[PDB]
Design a protein around this ligand. Structure first.
Ligand SMILES: CN1Cc2cc(S(=O)(=O)Nc3ccccc3)ccc2NC1=O
Length: 127
């Protein structure tokens, strides 16, 4: 009954960068999703322990969540936007894999993903 360590949000050996696309991701894409009524289950790592999902981390080996993404953005963890996009996709995909296609949690992930795809559609060209 332990959770894994969470995904890293800082790394002294990983080069860091600011891009206009990373700024958009924090200021428009994450901001839009974070304040959405369906954000809250996704605002922190899945706590398999407190939520009583004991097989969660047997099935999901690449956990991701918006809490993690927010810190990564804030900490300038990423070098490029594509890394951050891949984190959002990982988070959605994990939800779709672990849960049944009927579940409330899946319908929420889907609505957030739709809005995410709407916001990254207008991702500005880099400077
Ligand atoms: C991202 N999550 C997190 C998660 C949280 C929970 S919950 O027990 O809070 N129940 C709950 C909460 C909100 C909406 C619907 C159900 C259950 C399952 C999951 N599965 C996931 O995949």
């Amino acid at each position: 009954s332990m959770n894994p360590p969470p995904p890293e949000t800082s790394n002294p050996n990983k080069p860091k960068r600011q891009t206009n696309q990373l700024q958009y991701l924090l200021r428009v894409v994450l901001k839009t999703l974070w304040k959405h009524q369906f954000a809250w289950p996704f605002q922190q790592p899945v706590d398999a322990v407190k939520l009583n999902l004991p097989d969660y981390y047997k099935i999901i080996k690449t956990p991701m969540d918006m809490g993690t993404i927010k810190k990564r953005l804030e900490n300038n963890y990423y070098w490029n936007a594509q890394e951050c996009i891949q984190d959002f996709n990982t988070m959605f995909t994990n939800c779709y894999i672990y849960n049944k296609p009927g579940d409330d949690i899946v319908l929420m992930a889907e609505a957030l993903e739709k809005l995410f795809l709407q916001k990254i559609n207008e991702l500005p060209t880099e400077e």
